């Protein structure tokens, strides 16, 4: 590598199964609070004060 001009730089499939599973596995924790809950617009100055 070292100026191989890579995309999000990366030279193996092994780091593709590091980018996606470490985003996703700290994403699925975020989903476990915010799944199955939608809508409820509020029209205020940054309330978004639902729980």
């Amino acid at each position: 590598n070292a100026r191989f001009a890579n995309g999000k730089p990366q030279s193996i499939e092994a780091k593709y199964i590091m980018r996606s599973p470490a985003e996703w596995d700290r994403f699925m924790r975020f989903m476990d609070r915010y799944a199955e809950a939608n809508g409820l617009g509020f029209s205020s100055x940054x309330x978004x004060x639902x729980x």
């Binding site: 590598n1 070292a2 100026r3 191989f4 001009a5």
Partner: protein
Amino acid sequence: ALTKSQINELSYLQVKGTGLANRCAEVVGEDSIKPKPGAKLVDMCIEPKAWAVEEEVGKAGKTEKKFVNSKVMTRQTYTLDAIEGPITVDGGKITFSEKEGIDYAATTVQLPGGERVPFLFTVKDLVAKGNGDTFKPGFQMGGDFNTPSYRTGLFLDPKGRGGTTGYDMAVALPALQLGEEGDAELFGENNKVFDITQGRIEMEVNKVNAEDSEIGGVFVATQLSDTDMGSKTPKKVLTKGIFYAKVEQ
């Protein structure tokens, strides 16, 4: 590291970064060439693929001299390229007689133990001598070249002392002189001598293509390390790698 043909099929931008640029090309095939009076070798790629430095070794009960396989601290700046010299035959045996090219590669190679061994990997002023005529599966060349000093005399000691230039005195300690005996215990270091020593190389041509008139083989080179203007005793560096050339007519 492929042949010179499809290295030339790559643009500059798509080699740029790959580490291809040290790689000597390869030859496919076994053939003869039979050089003519007036030919020469033109693209003499020389890459060392392993380094080795003389030392004192410990083993079963006895200490003696051998070479450790050692690693390079310079990244990729270690191979020689585009060396040319007029080829001649006088007594039936082929001589190389190096003249131009990138004929030095200032590397530094760290010993097991922490010690850094800088040297010049040179082919400067080579005169080879073949085992016969007619470049073949096993035509071996060998000769003696010149290792010049690593730093030339314009280079300057961290206090401002050099061969050509610099101070002559210990600028540090200006009350060292003061007598009949001046700084004379530092005379072995204030004196910056440009030493030049002699190396050794032994080619061994393995594969020969005469459709492109190109040879390639495996060399073994032994030479001497840096002496910081005659301060330290230089070690004996042994390199091994592959080489490559293109024959004229």
